[PDB]
Design a protein around this ligand. Sequence first.
Ligand code: FES
Ligand code: FES
Lengths: 77, 76
Amino acid sequence: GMRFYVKDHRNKAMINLHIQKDNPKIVHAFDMEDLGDKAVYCRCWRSKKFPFCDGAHTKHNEETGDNVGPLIIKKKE
Amino acid sequence: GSGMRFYVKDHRNKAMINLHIQKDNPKIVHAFDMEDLGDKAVYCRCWRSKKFPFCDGAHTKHNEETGDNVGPLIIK
Ligand code: FES
Ligand code: FES
Protein backbone atom coordinates (compact mmCIF):
# COMPACT_ATOMS: atom_id res chain seq x y z
CA GLY A 1 0.00 0.00 0.00
CA MET A 2 2.81 2.45 0.78
CA ARG A 3 4.13 4.38 -2.22
CA PHE A 4 7.36 6.38 -2.25
CA TYR A 5 8.72 9.03 -4.56
CA VAL A 6 11.09 11.96 -4.41
CA LYS A 7 11.62 15.35 -6.06
CA ASP A 8 15.28 16.35 -6.44
CA HIS A 9 15.91 20.10 -6.21
CA ARG A 10 19.70 19.80 -5.86
CA ASN A 11 21.85 21.87 -8.21
CA LYS A 12 25.40 23.20 -8.46
CA ALA A 13 24.54 26.59 -9.95
CA MET A 14 26.08 29.76 -8.58
CA ILE A 15 23.71 31.69 -6.36
CA ASN A 16 25.21 35.03 -7.34
CA LEU A 17 25.26 35.26 -11.12
CA HIS A 18 26.49 38.82 -11.64
CA ILE A 19 27.34 40.89 -8.54
CA GLN A 20 30.87 42.19 -8.05
CA LYS A 21 32.59 39.15 -9.46
CA ASP A 22 36.03 40.79 -9.01
CA ASN A 23 35.47 40.27 -5.24
CA PRO A 24 36.44 36.72 -4.29
CA LYS A 25 34.01 36.62 -1.36
CA ILE A 26 31.32 39.24 -0.90
CA VAL A 27 30.83 40.10 2.77
CA HIS A 28 29.08 43.15 4.24
CA ALA A 29 29.35 44.57 7.72
CA PHE A 30 27.25 47.34 9.29
CA ASP A 31 27.10 49.07 12.69
CA MET A 32 23.72 49.01 14.45
CA GLU A 33 24.25 52.53 15.80
CA ASP A 34 24.20 53.93 12.25
CA LEU A 35 21.05 52.09 11.03
CA GLY A 36 17.66 53.74 10.44
CA ASP A 37 14.26 52.33 11.42
CA LYS A 38 14.58 49.28 9.15
CA ALA A 39 17.24 47.84 6.88
CA VAL A 40 16.13 45.20 4.38
CA TYR A 41 19.05 43.13 3.20
CA CYS A 42 19.02 40.96 0.08
CA ARG A 43 19.55 37.18 0.42
CA CYS A 44 18.84 36.30 -3.24
CA TRP A 45 21.79 38.09 -5.00
CA ARG A 46 19.48 39.59 -7.65
CA SER A 47 18.87 43.04 -6.20
CA LYS A 48 20.10 45.98 -8.27
CA LYS A 49 20.73 47.70 -4.89
CA PHE A 50 22.70 44.79 -3.33
CA PRO A 51 23.25 44.42 -0.35
CA PHE A 52 19.77 45.96 0.03
CA CYS A 53 16.59 44.21 -1.11
CA ASP A 54 14.77 45.81 -4.05
CA GLY A 55 12.08 43.14 -4.48
CA ALA A 56 14.03 41.20 -7.13
CA HIS A 57 13.53 38.03 -5.05
CA THR A 58 9.87 37.87 -6.16
CA LYS A 59 10.86 37.43 -9.83
CA HIS A 60 13.29 34.66 -8.91
CA ASN A 61 10.76 32.89 -6.68
CA GLU A 62 8.08 33.05 -9.33
CA GLU A 63 10.42 31.71 -12.03
CA THR A 64 12.03 28.85 -10.12
CA GLY A 65 9.38 28.01 -7.51
CA ASP A 66 11.79 29.14 -4.74
CA ASN A 67 10.81 30.82 -1.46
CA VAL A 68 13.70 33.12 -0.63
CA GLY A 69 13.24 36.50 1.05
CA PRO A 70 15.30 39.24 2.75
CA LEU A 71 16.74 39.72 6.26
CA ILE A 72 15.33 42.66 8.18
CA ILE A 73 17.10 44.49 10.97
CA LYS A 74 14.73 46.98 12.56
CA LYS A 75 14.15 49.21 15.58
CA LYS A 76 11.89 47.57 18.19
CA GLU A 77 8.35 49.02 18.49
CA GLY B 1 37.79 25.18 -38.44
CA SER B 2 38.27 27.66 -35.60
CA GLY B 3 39.63 25.58 -32.66
CA MET B 4 36.54 26.67 -30.71
CA ARG B 5 33.71 24.41 -29.58
CA PHE B 6 30.32 26.13 -29.46
CA TYR B 7 27.45 25.01 -27.26
CA VAL B 8 23.94 26.39 -27.77
CA LYS B 9 21.47 25.28 -25.08
CA ASP B 10 17.83 26.12 -24.46
CA HIS B 11 15.89 25.58 -21.22
CA ARG B 12 13.82 27.33 -18.54
CA ASN B 13 15.42 28.62 -15.33
CA LYS B 14 14.84 25.91 -12.70
CA ALA B 15 17.77 26.51 -10.29
CA MET B 16 16.54 27.34 -6.80
CA ILE B 17 18.82 29.25 -4.42
CA ASN B 18 17.30 27.61 -1.34
CA LEU B 19 17.31 23.86 -1.73
CA HIS B 20 15.84 22.73 1.60
CA ILE B 21 14.97 25.40 4.17
CA GLN B 22 11.39 25.86 5.45
CA LYS B 23 9.83 24.79 2.17
CA ASP B 24 6.25 25.01 3.58
CA ASN B 25 6.87 28.77 3.96
CA PRO B 26 6.20 30.47 0.59
CA LYS B 27 8.59 33.32 1.33
CA ILE B 28 11.22 33.19 4.03
CA VAL B 29 11.84 36.50 5.78
CA HIS B 30 13.58 37.03 9.11
CA ALA B 31 13.28 40.21 11.09
CA PHE B 32 15.23 41.02 14.22
CA ASP B 33 15.12 43.98 16.56
CA MET B 34 18.57 45.60 16.63
CA GLU B 35 18.23 46.37 20.35
CA ASP B 36 18.05 42.63 21.16
CA LEU B 37 21.09 41.55 19.14
CA GLY B 38 24.30 40.84 21.05
CA ASP B 39 27.60 42.50 20.16
CA LYS B 40 27.61 40.67 16.83
CA ALA B 41 25.49 38.56 14.53
CA VAL B 42 26.47 36.96 11.23
CA TYR B 43 23.68 36.10 8.79
CA CYS B 44 23.74 33.55 6.00
CA ARG B 45 23.16 34.76 2.49
CA CYS B 46 23.89 31.36 0.75
CA TRP B 47 21.00 29.26 2.21
CA ARG B 48 23.50 26.45 2.91
CA SER B 49 24.04 27.02 6.60
CA LYS B 50 23.00 24.23 8.94
CA LYS B 51 22.13 27.10 11.34
CA PHE B 52 20.15 29.32 8.94
CA PRO B 53 19.51 32.22 9.21
CA PHE B 54 22.98 32.33 10.84
CA CYS B 55 26.25 31.80 8.94
CA ASP B 56 28.08 28.61 9.91
CA GLY B 57 30.78 28.76 7.21
CA ALA B 58 28.89 26.55 4.72
CA HIS B 59 29.39 29.19 2.06
CA THR B 60 33.06 28.12 1.63
CA LYS B 61 32.04 24.70 0.29
CA HIS B 62 29.40 26.24 -1.93
CA ASN B 63 31.85 28.72 -3.41
CA GLU B 64 34.47 26.02 -4.03
CA GLU B 65 31.95 23.61 -5.63
CA THR B 66 30.18 26.17 -7.84
CA GLY B 67 32.84 28.85 -8.45
CA ASP B 68 30.66 31.46 -6.66
CA ASN B 69 31.74 34.32 -4.40
CA VAL B 70 28.97 34.67 -1.82
CA GLY B 71 29.42 35.50 1.83
CA PRO B 72 27.54 36.62 4.94
CA LEU B 73 26.16 39.81 6.41
CA ILE B 74 27.61 40.99 9.74
CA ILE B 75 25.67 43.32 12.06
CA LYS B 76 27.80 44.71 14.91
S1 FES C 1 15.93 41.50 -3.75
FE1 FES C 1 17.09 39.81 -2.93
S2 FES C 1 16.02 39.21 -1.07
FE2 FES C 1 14.80 40.88 -1.96
S1 FES D 1 26.92 29.77 5.66
FE1 FES D 1 25.72 30.93 4.18
S2 FES D 1 26.74 32.91 4.02
FE2 FES D 1 27.99 31.71 5.46
